[PDB]
Design a protein around this ligand. Structure first.
Ligand SMILES: Cc1cc2nc3c(=O)[nH]c(=O)nc-3n(C[C@H](O)[C@H](O)[C@H](O)COP(=O)(O)OP(=O)(O)OC[C@H]3O[C@@H](n4cnc5c(N)ncnc54)[C@H](O)[C@@H]3O)c2cc1C
Ligand SMILES: Cc1cc2nc3c(=O)[nH]c(=O)nc-3n(C[C@H](O)[C@H](O)[C@H](O)COP(=O)(O)OP(=O)(O)OC[C@H]3O[C@@H](n4cnc5c(N)ncnc54)[C@H](O)[C@@H]3O)c2cc1C
Lengths: 478, 476
């Protein structure tokens, strides 16, 4: 079935809107102890746990599909990941689900260095390139990340020995409150143009944001979770994905919950408001339908929360985090290209290009190379707005070496039910607001990867919070 | 509440059997869809999942306590860890249960390098000692581990890139190699200090001999932890529960009890499990019988050959259960009278019966706590002779301290474990893992000893109990 979300470009079709996904649900409805709002991995986990536990549970989702910020579209036999893609066995919650659903053997490596150009292309201005081996690229990035993360002499192991508890060492706060830009100022003279340029392209790819608005300590938190090394980051952040696409993973949550007979759902049904009453909570759809339950688990993202009317009023901390919003305006564009030899190419083009980091990520059945490309707020592009501009950005990663047969993307920035990609905090935002983002609010439990403790902003964080939400409901309802 | 398990020794009281544990269940009984045999983490996870899901579940346990190969004993306000101890957030299953139980902030570091002697004491013969900084110790072990693991150019990343699927690269002959054969290939590139360090470390993991420990199984621990020395440190020996493993076991127990669908009997060892046409029948040593539609059997690999199963098990199960795994790990705690040894570590190898030890804590009375390990190459049964056990301890740092207390449990002689944590013979995992995992009519065999990931860890137990509950759920 084909979803309203996403885009494709080919020479024969031009830009078209809406792409196939296994996440699309048919029919869109089948009609309460609990209402779960939103069917990303947070809502899916929570729904899976509550129904399995005996609770009569109703899923309300705005879109036509499950998966939220993470979903895949099969096109000519190749799964394009529109959002969240990479996982690893060091990510506790997603891994626990992969293995429980027997999908531990259903992964593919993104990297494949076994043939082709087998080099890293670094571009620091528009007219020229530098080329290196992947070993050389590793030495350059490790050297840069070393200097970047070494604020305590142990690359963050002293200030943040327990990433799940940011305040164990109170000096950590100073870094949460520091921006990319501030940190770089302290090491600027110790970095080459090549180390600085790679570093910034890489950390801005993580944050989606700008050097001024991304929290250095949020990055130290990612670093710490991955084991405080460059190799641990590579492994956790961009090495392994689902051979059949993320939406096949989401379908396992969905089939489990459906299979209980305790699941109610409605898709294409955006929520306008959630009001606490005496016995219960009343949820109102934009289309005016109404639904009542003893508890509501609300998994709407941080950047979307200000569109919803809550009663009573949220706290000051919830209000200001939601008004400032997180900074990830990440653009992710997929290109199926006609150069077979670029399977083993990787590339950074920074700061002059609207896509700054890219990798060869696979081979389609038709034998073309699949490139995935990322850009951020520091040099932003809305990839749907001018196909010719998007193609320039893709080609400037490796000028004069391929033609594009196809583009595939979803625009997370203009999507009204995301308004941003995965969470990434402003300087000071997590230390100031995390506690307020996680607290109870009547019979409303707020749960989203955006405010997880461990892998915050990943699929793993979304599953952590879905699990938490289910346990809170379980304790309170019995 | 005291357990039949464990031992304690002091100068004043001598050697006494039985020690306290939060894991002791009293009253032992409260009397089916499902019978779970075993109350270690595997069974606890399986029971927690089955109950929460609505199944009428019977738990039968041989011991007077839950936790199996992992439990803690609170003595004068200090948790002694009789078996499985360390966890990390890179261990998916234990970490998931830790955060879901809100215990993510209830851990503490074993290592404290802020005061005290702050050195590593290496002993390669009975008459001397070499002393280093902890930095130099890290350099020495990193160098030894690099040479040991570097079979493929990338420290195992090429032959074992997906530890959960050992056959992904067929070249992964390493499973069929012993510690001994691996060291033979790199013998000439290792100094005495690198070799002694390395052998002590690797034998502390396996609890076995150089000739009977799979090199490949070690490559697997090493891959699971990230292929680095530092990753092994983080995963294997850094963080433990402030309140002891038994307080974590209690959370699973309270959750399953709270459902109202839990039946249970402790001190109830099982002799047979028979598959009938409708159900499966489980008979205790004393003759009591219990019937369920399904059975989750979590008895350890080394105890299985004591059980009659109907019908016969595959040749693979039988071979593995008859050969057994090689971990005969001896683990000894000492409360000692030297405060400066909080930051001490030592290896004494090959001449001592405990070869590896660390400052792990400080009791409420203000004394240093040392945890000490021995293997099968120079083995001691710590209960047989207290004075030999004290000597084994003293010789880790001769002349530097007196022993106020010992605490330990003999896992080897324990009829419901017959070994410690799983660790395999060369080839045993290649040959038998598939067998050890296949269904047996109405009986699901689950145990950390044949998990795919953190096999032989607490994590591996929770992996397997989760699997078992998914399987039973799928079938009923
Ligand atoms: C481009 C991109 C790349 C990423 N890369 C990775 C990666 O490699 N690895 C990784 O682990 N993570 C990655 N992430 C992040 C990960 O995908 C998300 O953090 C995770 O999916 C968040 O899940 P969630 O359930 O907390 O929130 P969401 O998936 O955002 O789910 C929230 C749900 O609420 C619904 N909703 C919104 N408004 C309403 C409303 N008004 N009424 C009803 N429903 C509503 C939404 O439609 C959505 O279904 C990436 C994200 C993006 C966007
Ligand atoms: C000394 C030592 C140190 C270790 N170090 C660590 C560590 O640091 N970190 C870590 O993660 N792991 C460690 N391990 C491993 C970890 O403790 C075990 O792998 C894990 O606890 C096993 O869990 P399990 O539920 O699969 O097996 P078990 O805990 O062995 O449970 C099996 C249950 O079966 C019961 N049983 C046996 N026979 C019968 C019978 N006939 N009838 C009824 N019941 C029976 C047993 O009493 C037991 O309760 C260690 C183990 C030991 C011994």
């Amino acid at each position: 079935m084909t979803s309203r979300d996403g885009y494709q470009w080919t020479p024969e079709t031009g830009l078209t809107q809406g792409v196939p996904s296994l996440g699309v649900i048919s029919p869109p409805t089948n009609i309460w102890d609990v209402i779960v709002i939103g069917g990303g991995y947070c809502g899916l986990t929570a729904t899976r746990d509550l129904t399995v536990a005996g609770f009569k549970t109703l899923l309300l989702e705005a879109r036509d599909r499950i998966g939220g910020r993470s979903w895949s579209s099969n096109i000519d036999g190749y799964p394009y990941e529109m959002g969240g893609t990479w996982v690893h066995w060091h990510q506790s919650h997603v891994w626990r689900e992969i293995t429980r659903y027997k999908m531990h053997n259903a992964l593919s490596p993104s990297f494949n260095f076994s043939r082709g150009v087998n080099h890293f292309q670094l571009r620091t201005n528009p007219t020229t390139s530098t080329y290196m081996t992947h070993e050389a690229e590793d030495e350059l990035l490790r050297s840069a990340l070393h200097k970047f993360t070494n604020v305590d002499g142990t690359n963050g192991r002293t200030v943040l020995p327990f990433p799940h508890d940011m305040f164990y060492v109170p000096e950590f706060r100073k870094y949460d409150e520091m921006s990319y830009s501030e940190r770089i100022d302290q090491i600027r003279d110790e970095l080459s143009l090549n180390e600085r340029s790679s570093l910034e392209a890489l950390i801005l790819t993580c944050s989606g944001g700008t050097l001024e608005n991304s929290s250095f300590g949020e990055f130290l938190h990612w670093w710490a979770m991955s084991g405080y090394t460059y190799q641990g980051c590579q492994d956790c952040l961009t090495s392994y994905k689902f051979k059949d696409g993320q939406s096949a993973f989401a379908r396992r949550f969905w089939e489990e919950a459906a299979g209980t007979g305790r699941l109610g759902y409605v898709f294409g049904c955006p929520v306008r408001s959630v009001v606490n009453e005496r016995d219960a909570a009343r949820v109102t759809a934009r289309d005016g339908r109404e639904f009542v339950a003893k508890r509501v688990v609300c998994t709407i993202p941080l950047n979307v929360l200000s569109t919803i009317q809550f009663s009573p009023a949220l706290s000051t901390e919830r209000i200001s985090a939601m008004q400032a919003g997180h900074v990830s305006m990440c653009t992710k564009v997929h290109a199926e290209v006609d150069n077979k030899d670029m399977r083993s190419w990787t590339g950074i083009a920074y700061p002059f290009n609207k896509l700054c980091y890219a990798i060869g990520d696979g081979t389609t059945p038709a034998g073309n190379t699949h490139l995935v490309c990322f850009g951020n707020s520091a040099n932003h592009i809305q990839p749907d707005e001018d196909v010719r501009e998007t193609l320039k950005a893709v080609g400037q990663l490796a000028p004069g070496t391929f033609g594009v047969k196809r583009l595939v993307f979803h625009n997370w920035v203009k999507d009204e039910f995301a308004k941003g990609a995965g969470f990434f905090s402003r300087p000071g935002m997590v230390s100031e607001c995390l506690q307020g983002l996680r607290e109870k609010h009547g019979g409303v439990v707020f749960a989203n990867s955006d405010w997880a403790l461990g892998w915050r902003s990943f699929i793993d964080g979304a599953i952590e919070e879905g699990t938490r939400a289910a346990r809170v409901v379980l304790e309170e309802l019995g």
